Design goal:
Organism of A: Pisum sativum
Radius of gyration of chain B: 13 Å
Keywords: antenna, reaction center
CATH class of chain B: Alpha Beta
Largest sheet of chain C: none
Structural class of chain B: mainly beta
Chains: A mainly alpha (about 750), B mainly beta (about 80), C mainly alpha (about 80), D mainly alpha (about 40), E mainly alpha (about 160), F alpha+beta (about 140), G mainly alpha (about 150)
Number of domains of chain C: 1
Largest interface: C-E, 40 and 48 residues
Order of helices and strands of chain C: HHH
Order of helices and strands of chain B: EHEEE
Radius of gyration of chain C: 30 Å
Shape of chain B: elongated
PDB class: photosynthesis
Number of strands of chain C: 0
Oligomer: part of a larger assembly
Distance between the termini of chain C: 82 Å
Entry title: The structure of plant photosystem I super-complex at 2.8 angstrom resolution.
Chain A: Photosystem I P700 chlorophyll a apoprotein A1
Bound molecules: chlorophyll A, 1,2-dipalmitoyl-phosphatidyl-glycerole
Shape of chain C: elongated
Strand content of chain B: 15-25%
Strand order of the largest sheet of chain B: 1-4
Helix content of chain C: 25-40%
CATH topology of chain B: Alpha-Beta Plaits
Number of strands of chain B: 4
Number of helices of chain C: 3
């Protein structure tokens, strides 16, 4: 076969269908008879494979939808750059980053809100931002508000192009099903074209704009005096005085004999003692390897020249004694089901966001990011939630595939088979591990609480009594310390300062990073992590494996992916559906992530962040109480929650009172969720009966018959507010705390 | 086991019999409606109580009702 | 593998899987020593009573003690708020 | 386009309505702030 | 073409599956020789062995992790607790048996051998046998604790 | 009319599943469903994952019955097939369950006699107090 | 009325005083001719105006130093509750009356729900000003106010 560009001519464009609500569904396009109609309209709006059964049409819908998504992201980026141009103190912050608070939002003087425009420094009144954009912009060598303004226009223009493309590829030239399926092609391009050229491109701006300008900023020269980026490209003299390797052209690269380029590219590693961020000389070099690597990787798959790989070939040839003919037929499944692809992608993109958070705190990439605790606590916590959510979404679509696309008669797999043929063995074991982890992580805490309360500190699990020293993580930690020179001779300093041992970095009076200690307190929390994660996995995997059938419900697959139950029979069968497993898994992801970000916040303030003076004396924020008081639930209640929540409950009258409002505001919607979660629509519908009576009495009863929320929606509404309330509370709590104290 | 009854309000649509997962109901000759048939619960010992029958009745008020009663192995839907 | 009404047991996998059926590997006399000395506890009922009454009073007996915590001991008691 | 008019007057009618209301309320306040009572009688 | 994983005893419509951890010759040999599976032996006899092994083993955790030692001279007394747990357990067993099996009743184990050799009537699992098993479990349990404790007095072991 | 009987007929090709019979089958009951297949075909097992129908008569033993009807119902549609299922017990007696009266239950048959039908339909039942202390229940009437 | 009028309350004066000093403190960092300064001076002028009006409109104050409202019906404080309230009931009645005028216009029609999710704005604009004289709902009440079926 030969891969090519395939499209079709115009397929309609009119406001006619805008005027017709629920047009996409044949059931709902007839209009409402009850208020249920309205909710269904929004819940089935994006269910494309529920609209039609043609794979070509569904594929064309999701393709333009991605253009729509990108359009928004570009419009969203356009605003952040614009606000950094009109309503910000970036130019002020650019001179004194260590003392001036970054702010990019001014509030109108109505009703008394102007109080939120607090003293952020630089003779500026506004709201302190924790997005981190200031450190990105300084890293890109962005000097003036003009350049941020130009990027704002550039992003807005791109937003228009993205939006235009979506219309063009759904209404004008719609890609054919064969085009979407060319996966050997797409992977080649996304590997080489998007990632390879993308990383290559940024490696260029760095070694021409970022690296030159950043050196000036660090020398201490006034930002307004620093030559524009284009003065470095034109006159190579400027980029020759600093980084003299530029004296030659393509040589030595072209003549190989690498390199005299060690001058602006190196494997130094560690952290810049003056900026607190990763060496820009390393990052530029880093993107150089990433480019080439992905450019190499972009030539694995065979297309139109017989050289490369057929993915279908690779899979089929991977079969063992234990697994059967497994992997055979996976290519046809993954090229035929969107949900199958989305599940894998969510699981992986979500997992990636989580490693990003752990990598950006321990290896601070942007200049003056480490000592801005307000941002670092926000960035880590933000990615933890984003990654956390995306992972739960993988379970949902894995389940949807099982219900909707799974067909043994047409697209058998054998690997997917067998798994279903011992799903009780997998779930029963995962059940056991969770119970073991629960007792052996949380039970240790309850032990500690009881012994402490009985006045038996020596009978506790602690560093001063019965120690549970996490030696495996400690040994590794030590190994990365002895890594440079010994294992990796090219590396000058350690990978991270958490592995440094006897190295510390400070910017201003604040600590950027230092070796992070590990003790019994860290042992207990990690098993708590190991525990909470497994239970989340249990709920979701159980939902996927038993999505189709069960000893209780032989034909669950016929009931669909999202149904309330199958009645009170068989003892009761509420929340048997795969949807309800995602619903239940959502709470447990929340439970797990919440104790993760609390683990972060306390550990950093207690053992890492704090004030340092020029005598070496380090004074941490909470003063190193993590080791002796995080090993007790009462300790978490008192020394963590009670103690640190004082900032947000004492923020009224201050610039941080909005956090005080959102603190209580989020407690409200959280408790509000409990009305929906603890009750059933049977009561509410009967209550509405008495209320409907009153309206009929006064001739003001609506034709659209009011109905209580569906059983599933009641759960959807409940978990949504439980999440919004709980997460927003910690948000207000975190930001108020870290902005006031930090 | 559970208790399941039928009423002369039945119109012989036959939908519940089609809805039942454990073959509890069946249709029998009658002369109270144009369909000339009516549902019957001759095997309530095999019923589980999922009410799929009720969920499928179009009579104003259900003509087939399921009154959950004493629990048995059959009704508890146990494969063990 | 099979299915005969004749033999339901076998039809429904009622197999003594890991069963031995082998002769006793235990040396005799040893068995006989244990068979005559552990015999009183094999009657049931009586064992139940022996463990309750015996276990109960044996437990009571450790009522008696020293380095448990029977000593508020010479320590001046606080007041310690409005007093009392 | 008749039809475009039709997209409108949907729940976009709510937002156009409430945005107008919000504006009016805001201007009133900007004009008469901190009012705890009706003092004209 | 050779798969390792097979239906149980060749019957794919029955619960379990055959895997290396279930039907290996090593696993089969080991499990068939535990005191529990010696179907043809005195239940009382089988029990004592279980008690002895279990008893002996229980002393360790109680003594080492006990409130009484942990640098506190109480020491080997813990073993005494272990002697208390084998009493609790014995009670449970006695209860399980009494409730399960009736006096007149016969065995409830399975007579067919895995291979269908109907030839085999079996076990305790009767009111009479179980009582014997527990009764022996106790005797062995107490004796197990005592001998471990006995070793504790003599000493020499690296942990304690 | 007399029901069909069996049984020595072969069973379908499967590899083994964990959803299979348990002790309940051994000591309480178990079920068998049987059918005739025109071709050797592949079908989704209620308990497990995937199995191959064997051309000609086929025999399957399942626990719980509902599993029997779920599979059987699938057999009727999807592919056109005629099926029947019986209740085994442990002694060896067997019991014909479905269809049980010649024809399927959806279709009205003259042989059938009504059970549990109240001719005073409606919710014309009496208040609980009326039967208080009378073992009866209002619907039973 | 165990309170003292705000005009003659020391606590009420201490609050105006303390508030102005807080805003003036912030005034120091920004220097004179400045945007924040003008913004803060505008809040200060808005602050003085506020307290001035409360005293001017005879509102009592509590030991706390904050005004308190009398809703008993006392004539000196209708401004506090009764006057604004009647204003409310007028508007609330207006909205409800217009809303009920729409449903009755809609009820005998085609698909009535169609105009409940897609508003008939020509019809609505025709009925909105009927709420101006909504308290002549009273005269509907003398006849066709509410349904007799229930
Ligand atoms: C500008 C002219 C235009 C017109 C007249 C149409 C008309 C139509 N489109 Mg096309 N479309 C357009 C532009 C247009 N589209 C563009 C620029 C894109 C790229 C994204 C698309 C991509 C697209 C897809 C994938 C599909 C259509 C479909 C349709 C038909 C369904 C009608 C409908 O209800 O749409 C919807 C009306 C709306 C008002 C939806 C608005 C959605 C926007 C993007 C939300 C923006 C996000 C928002 C900011 C989130 C914040 C919320 C928060 C503030 C609370 C209809 C003929 C569908 C079809 O063929 O029917 C089966 C279909 O599948 N369109
Ligand atoms: C995409 C995300 C985004 C978000 C959340 C905001 C949010 C905001 N903007 Mg920005 N803006 C954006 C993108 C965004 N903007 C882009 C892409 C541009 C370039 C065209 C602008 C250009 C812009 C200007 C010129 C101003 C704002 C202003 C505002 C604030 C006033 C709220 C308002 O509009 O009043 C009500 C809304 C309306 C009247 C129309 C609806 C608010 C915080 C104002 C501000 O900051 O106040 C001093 C203001 O002056 N924005
Ligand atoms: C090697 C060239 C190339 C590049 C750079 C891309 C890039 C992208 N693709 Mg495309 N793709 C390609 C080849 C390429 N693709 C080919 C040959 C096929 C056919 C098999 C596809 C089929 C395909 C599908 C089905 C989808 C994508 C999507 C995407 C976007 C993923 C989201 C993102 O990263 O946002 C980042 C945004 C950017 C990096 C801006 C780049 C904008 C253009 C490409 C710049 C090119 C300018 C150039 C110098 C001239 C991304 C823009 C997804 C999408 O989001 O749809 C809109 C999507 O669903 N691609
Ligand atoms: C991101 C992609 C990218 C792009 C578009 C460019 C583009 C350019 N480079 Mg750069 N370069 C890049 C990546 C890139 N480079 C990387 C990753 C490295 C490190 C290996 C270099 C190292 C480099 C050197 C040493 C020089 C250039 C120079 C140039 C300019 C060519 C002038 C000339 O003919 O030489 C004669 C041109 C603007 C030359 C220049 O600065 O212009 C005078 C030059 O001296 N580049
Ligand atoms: C790549 C990302 C991605 C994509 C493309 C999809 C796509 C889809 N999902 Mg999946 N999902 C995802 C991630 C994703 N999901 C994640 C991360 C989770 C875990 C929570 C889920 C869990 C999930 C479930 C349980 C279900 C889906 C379903 C669907 C399908 C229809 C959904 C719909 O109509 O939209 C409708 C959109 C709405 C009704 C918007 C509701 C607003 C939300 C609930 C609250 C937003 C609040 C906001 C964040 C902040 C508050 C602001 C407020 C005050 C204004 C569609 C194929 C449904 C399905 O049946 O699949 C076929 C289905 O039931 N998804
Ligand atoms: C704080 C309240 C709370 C607690 C304690 C639990 C506990 C548990 N959940 Mg639940 N869960 C909760 C809230 C809670 N959940 C809420 C609000 C939801 C709604 C979304 C869920 C949804 C949910 C699902 C879907 C699942 C669980 C599961 C589990 C079990 C996980 C396995 C385990 O750890 O074993 C260990 C048990 C503990 C750690 C409990 C504490 C034990 C104490 C400390 C020791 C014993 C005390 C003492 C010695 C006992 C003797 C006292 C005597 C006087 C009687 C565990 C029992 C999973 C499961 O079933 O397990 C496999 C499961 O799938 N939960
Ligand atoms: C098992 C743990 C472990 C890990 C994770 C690493 C990881 C690494 N090693 Mg080390 N190494 C190890 C064990 C390990 N090594 C042991 C046990 C020894 C013997 C004592 C070495 C001796 C060693 C040497 C001599 C070098 C490394 C280098 C490297 C780095 C580049 C490796 C590479 O292929 O790039 C690609 C390399 C090429 C394309 C050129 C091939 C020639 C290579 C470098 C030899 C990488 C960080 C290199 C380094 O220092 O990085 C800065 C390097 O020169 N390692
Ligand atoms: C774009 C920024 C902007 C600016 C500079 C103004 C400026 C003004 N507005 Mg407008 N307004 C705006 C946005 C804006 N508004 C928006 C987005 C809305 C909602 C759509 C409104 C709704 C609005 C209303 C309802 C009114 C104003 C009025 C006024 C004027 C006050 C008249 C006066 O003398 O006070 C004193 C007046 C006394 C009676 C004393 C002033 C010129 C007032 C006006 O002039 O009427 C036409 C008026 O009442 N505005
Ligand atoms: C607790 C029940 C209660 C109720 C229902 C009322 C009701 C009323 N009070 Mg009374 N009051 C009460 C308790 C109560 N009060 C108590 C406990 C005190 C002790 C101070 C007072 C002291 C008090 C004073 C000094 C006055 C009232 C007045 C009024 C009337 C004002 C409304 C109006 O002007 O007409 C309706 C107007 C429109 C519909 C337009 C109203 C009838 C006022 C009055 O007498 O009315 C002339 C007035 O002068 N009240
Ligand atoms: C660190 C987190 C992991 C903790 C380790 C304990 C968790 C074990 C959970 C799964 C155990 C079940 C393994 C049987 C599942 C099974 O049979 O897999 C099949 C596999 C045999 O491979 P095959 O010959 O089938 O390979 C060919 C095809 O599978 C590939 O195309 O055996 C293993 O995976 C050995 C590694 C097990 C250890 C995994 C870790």
């Amino acid at each position: 076969e030969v891969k090519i560009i395939l499209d079709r001519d115009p397929i309609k464009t009119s406001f006619e269908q805008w005027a017709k609500p629920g047009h996409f569904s044949r059931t709902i396009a007839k209009g409402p008879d009850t208020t249920t109609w309205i909710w269904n309209l929004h819940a089935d709006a994006h269910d494309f494979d529920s609209h039609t059964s043609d794979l070509e049409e569904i594929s064309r819908k999701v393709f333009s939808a991605h253009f729509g998504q990108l359009s928004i992201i570009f419009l969203w980026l356009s605003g952040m750059y614009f606000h950094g141009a009109r309503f910000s103190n970036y130019e002020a912050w650019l001179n004194d980053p260590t003392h001036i608070r970054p702010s990019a939002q001014v509030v109108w003087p109505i009703v008394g809100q102007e109080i939120l425009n607090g003293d952020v420094g630089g003779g500026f009144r506004g709201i302190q931002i924790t997005s981190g954009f200031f450190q990105i912009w300084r890293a890109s060598g962005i000097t003036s508000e003009l350049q941020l303004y130009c990027t704002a226009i550039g992003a807005l223009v791109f937003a228009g192009l993205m939006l235009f493309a979506g219309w063009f590829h759904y209404h004008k030239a719609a890609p054919k099903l064969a085009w979407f399926q060319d996966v050997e092609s797409m992977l080649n391009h996304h590997l080489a074209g998007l990632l390879g050229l993308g990383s290559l491109s940024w490696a260029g701006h760095q070694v021409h704009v970022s690296l030159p300008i950043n050196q000036f900023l660090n020398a201490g020269v006034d930002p307004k005096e620093i030559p524009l980026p284009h003065e470095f490209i034109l006159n190579r003299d400027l980029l020759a005085q600093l980084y003299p390797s530029f004296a030659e052209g393509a040589t030595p690269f072209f003549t190989l004999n690498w390199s005299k380029y060690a001058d602006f590219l190196t494997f130094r590693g560690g952290l810049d003692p003056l900026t607190g961020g990763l060496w820009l000389t390393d990052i530029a070099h880093h993107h150089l390897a990433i480019a080439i690597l992905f450019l190499i990787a972009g030539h694995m798959y065979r297309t139109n020249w017989g050289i490369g790989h057929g993915i279908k070939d690779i899979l089929e040839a991977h079969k063992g004694p234990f697994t059967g003919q497994g992997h055979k037929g996976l290519y046809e499944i993954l090229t035929t089901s969107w949900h199958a692809q989305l599940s894998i992608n969510l699981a992986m993109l979500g997992s990636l966001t989580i490693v990003v958070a752990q990598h950006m705190y321990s290896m601070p990439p942007y200049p003056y990011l480490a000592t801005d605790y307000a941002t670092q606590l926000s960035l880590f916590t933000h990615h933890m939630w984003i990654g956390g959510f995306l992972i739960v979404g993988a379970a949902a679509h894995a389940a949807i595939f099982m219900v909707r696309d799974y067909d043994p008669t047409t697209r058998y797999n054998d690997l997917l088979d067998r798994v279903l043929r011992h799903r009780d063995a997998i779930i029963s074991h995962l059940n056991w591990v969770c119970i073991f982890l629960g007792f052996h992580s949380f039970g240790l805490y309850i032990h500690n609480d009881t012994m402490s309360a009985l006045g038996r500190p020596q009978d506790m699990f602690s560093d001063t009594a019965i120690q549970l020293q996490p030696v495996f993580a400690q040994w590794i930690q030590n190994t990365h310390a002895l890594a440079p020179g010994t294992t990796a001779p090219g590396a000058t300093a350690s990978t991270s300062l958490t592995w440094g041992g006897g190295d510390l970095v400070a910017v201003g009076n604040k600590v950027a990073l230092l070796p992070i200690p590990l003790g019994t307190a860290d042992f207990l929390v990690h098993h708590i992590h190991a525990f909470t994660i497994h239970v989340t996995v249990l709920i979701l995997l159980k939902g996927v494996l038993f999505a189709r059938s069960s000893r209780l419900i032989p034909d669950k697959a016929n009931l669909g992916f999202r149904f309330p139950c199958d009645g009170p029979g068989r003892g009761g069968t509420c929340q048997v559906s795969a949807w309800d497993h995602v619903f239940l898994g959502l709470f447990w992801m929340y439970n797990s992530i919440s104790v993760v970000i609390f683990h972060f916040s306390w550990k950093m303030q207690s053992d890492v962040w704090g004030t340092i003076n020029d005598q070496g004396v380090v004074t941490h924020i909470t003063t190193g109480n993590f080791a002796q008081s995080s090993i007790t639930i009462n300790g978490w209640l008192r020394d963590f929650l009670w103690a640190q929540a004082s900032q947000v409950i004492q923020s009224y009258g201050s610039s941080l009172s909005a956090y005080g409002l959102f603190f209580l505001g989020a407690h409200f919607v959280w408790a509000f969720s409990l009305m929906f979660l603890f009750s059933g629509r049977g009561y509410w519908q009967e209550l509405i009966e008495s209320i409907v009576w009153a309206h009929n009495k006064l001739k003001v009863a609506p034709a659209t018959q009011p109905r209580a929320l569906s059983i599933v929606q009641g759960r959807a509404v409940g978990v949504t507010h439980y999440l919004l309330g709980g997460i927003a509370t910690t948000w207000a709590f975190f930001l108020a705390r870290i902005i006031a104290v930090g | 086991s559970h208790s399941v009854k039928i009423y002369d309000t039945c119109i012989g649509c036959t939908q519940c019999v089609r809805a039942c997962p454990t073959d509890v109901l069946e249709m029998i000759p009658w002369g109270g409606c144009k369909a000339k048939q009516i549902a019957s619960a001759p095997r309530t010992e095999d019923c589980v109580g999922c009410k799929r029958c009720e969920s499928a009745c179009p009579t104003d008020f259900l003509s087939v009702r399921v009154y959950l009663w004493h629990e048995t192995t059959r009704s508890m839907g146990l494969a063990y | 593998v099979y299915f005969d009404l004749e033999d339901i047991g076998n039809t429904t996998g009622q197999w003594d899987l890991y069963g031995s059926d082998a002769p006793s590997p235990y040396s005799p006399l040893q068995s006989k020593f244990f068979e005559t000395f552990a015999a009183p506890f094999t009657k049931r009922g009586l064992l139940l009573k022996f463990l309750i009454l015996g276990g109960g009073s044996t437990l009571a007996y450790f009522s008696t003690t020293a380095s448990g915590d029977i000593l508020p001991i010479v320590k001046g008691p606080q007041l310690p708020p409005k007093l009392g | 386009r008749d039809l475009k008019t039709y997209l409108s007057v949907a729940p976009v009618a709510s937002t156009l309505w409430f945005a107008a209301l919000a504006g009016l309320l805001i201007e009133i306040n900007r004009l008469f702030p901190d009012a705890l009572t009706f003092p004209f009688f | 073409t050779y798969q390792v994983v097979q239906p149980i005893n060749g019957d794919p419509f029955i619960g379990s599956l055959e895997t290396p951890v279930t039907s290996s010759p090593l696993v089969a040999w080991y499990l068939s020789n535990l005191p529990g599976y010696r179907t043809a032996v005195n239940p009382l006899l089988r029990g004592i062995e279980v008690g002895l092994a279990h008893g002996f083993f229980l002393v360790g955790p109680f003594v080492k992790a006990g409130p009484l030692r942990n640098t506190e001279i109480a020491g080997q007394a813990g073993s005494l607790a272990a002697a208390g747990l084998v009493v609790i357990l014995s009670i449970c067993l006695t209860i399980y048996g009494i409730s399960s099996f009736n006096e007149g009743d016969p065995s409830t184990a399975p007579s067919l051998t895995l291979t269908g050799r109907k030839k085999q009537p079996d076990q305790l699992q009767t009111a009479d046998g179980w009582a014997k098993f527990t009764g022996g479990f106790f005797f062995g349990g107490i004796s197990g604790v005592i001998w471990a404790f006995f070793l504790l007095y003599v000493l020499d072991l690296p942990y304690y | 009319t007399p029901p069909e009987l069996d049984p020595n007929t072969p069973s379908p090709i499967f590899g083994g599943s964990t959803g299979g019979l348990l002790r309940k089958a051994q000591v309480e009951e178990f079920y068998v469903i049987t059918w005739e297949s025109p071709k050797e075909q592949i079908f989704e097992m209620p308990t497990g994952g995937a199995a191959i129908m064997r051309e000609g008569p086929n025999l399957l033993k399942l626990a719980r019955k509902e599993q029997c009807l779920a599979l059987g119902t699938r057999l009727r549609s999807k592919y056109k097939i005629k099926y029947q299922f019986y209740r085994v017990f442990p002694s060896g007696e067997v019991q014909y369950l479905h269809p049980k009266d010649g024809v399927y239950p959806e279709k009205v048959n003259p042989g059938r006699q009504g059970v549990g039908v109240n001719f005073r339909s409606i919710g014309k039942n009496v208040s609980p107090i009326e039967v208080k202390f009378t073992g009866k229940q209002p619907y039973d009437l | 009325s165990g309170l003292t009028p705000c005009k003659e309350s020391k606590q009420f004066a201490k609050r105006e005083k303390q508030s102005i000093k807080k805003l003036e403190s912030s005034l120091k960092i920004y220097a004179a001719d400045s945007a924040p300064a003008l913004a803060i001076n505008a809040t200060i002028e808005k602050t003085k105006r506020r307290f001035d009006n409360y005293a001017k409109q005879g509102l009592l104050c509590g030991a706390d130093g904050l005004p308190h409202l009398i809703v008993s019906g006392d004539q000196r404080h209708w401004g506090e509750f009764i006057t604004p309230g009647i204003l409310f009931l007028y508007i609330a009645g207006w909205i409800g009356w217009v809303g009920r005028s729409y449903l009755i216009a809609i009820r005998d029609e085609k698909k009535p729900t169609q105009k409940e999710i897609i508003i008939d704005v020509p019809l609505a604009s025709r009925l909105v000003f009927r709420g101006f004289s909504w308290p002549i709902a009273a005269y509907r009440e003398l006849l066709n106010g509410e349904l007799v079926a229930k």
